[PDB]
Design a protein around this ligand. Structure first.
Ligand SMILES: Cn1c(=O)cc(CP(=O)(O)O)c2cc(F)c(N3CCOCC3)cc21
Length: 269
């Protein structure tokens, strides 16, 4: 409900110090109060699509009883850079559930590409997002090409608002059956790659689940989260950055600061 004006000036200052663009959308699921800053602009997803990928697998598991237990074998040529779990199981294979947990909690690229194949590719994940009423999300390519983060390129992008709206439907709404919903939440809560991003703005006594993304170019990186502050309804938020020059560096500190400003805007402790 507006509330951005409490923190609209602070966002523009943070953005000016960063030297690029910051996109934020945060929702108090109790009141429906929102904070928005560049919330409708497109930003590259980078690895952040992997959370939605795991949710799409869980949705398919509601129709296919054996799916999560299915063993998947893969060759050395499936191991693209940043595959920290799948590299340890090359000689054995992993289950669909294990690949989904690795994609979410370690951002594992081979795991992401293997689960994309299971869903019919980037268009299959895009189709899942359309099925929950997200008209903004678009995945077009696979790992690692989807990380190009070219200025003006809508491929492999969404908006902070659409990311938050979809995360709410999947973690707190009715887009997944209850058991699948709690599995998605538990995967996000167990993420290992987000300690310096939204989590850095969240007190130790609040539960949080998140998914990160880092493209490695154009100052482009992001995080989205569900946060459970004690004694009030959960908050859902998305923080995305990009910058104009290919060799601009991302900043985890800027993502944590933007998250802090979003929570302060919502009046959250
Ligand atoms: C640098 N970096 C990080 O810090 C953290 C992550 C994990 P994320 O935050 O994306 O979940 C990461 C993931 C990558 F896929 C990645 N590559 C992108 C494609 O080009 C090669 C580098 C880099 C990455």
């Amino acid at each position: 409900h507006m509330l951005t004006n409490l923190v609209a000036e602070p966002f523009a200052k943070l953005e000016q110090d960063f030297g690029g663009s910051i996109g934020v959308y945060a929702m108090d699921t109790g009141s429906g109060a929102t904070v928005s800053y560049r919330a409708e602009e497109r930003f590259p997803l980078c690895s952040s699509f992997k959370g939605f990928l795991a949710a799409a697998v869980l949705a398919r598991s509601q129709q296919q009883a054996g799916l999560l237990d299915t063993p998947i074998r893969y060759g050395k040529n499936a191991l693209v850079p940043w595959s920290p779990i799948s590299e340890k199981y090359l000689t054995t294979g992993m289950t669909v559930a294990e690949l989904s947990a690795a994609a979410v909690q370690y951002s594992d690229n081979a795991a992401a590409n293997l689960l994309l194949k299971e869903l019919g590719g980037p268009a299959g994940l895009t189709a899942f997002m359309r099925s929950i009423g997200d008209t903004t999300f678009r995945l077009d390519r696979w790992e690692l090409e989807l990380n190009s983060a070219i200025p003006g390129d809508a491929r492999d992008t969404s908006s902070p608002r659409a990311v938050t709206e979809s995360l709410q439907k999947l973690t707190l709404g009715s887009a997944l059956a209850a058991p699948q919903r709690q599995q998605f939440v538990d995967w996000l809560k167990g993420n290992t790659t987000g300690n310096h991003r939204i989590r850095a703005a969240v007190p130790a006594d609040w539960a949080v689940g998140d998914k990160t993304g880092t493209c490695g170019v154009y100052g482009t990186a992001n995080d989205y989260a569900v946060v459970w502050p004690t004694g009030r309804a959960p908050i859902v938020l998305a923080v995305y950055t990009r910058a104009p020059n290919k060799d601009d560096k991302h900043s985890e500190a800027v993502i944590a600061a933007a998250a802090r400003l979003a929570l302060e805007g919502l009046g959250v402790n």
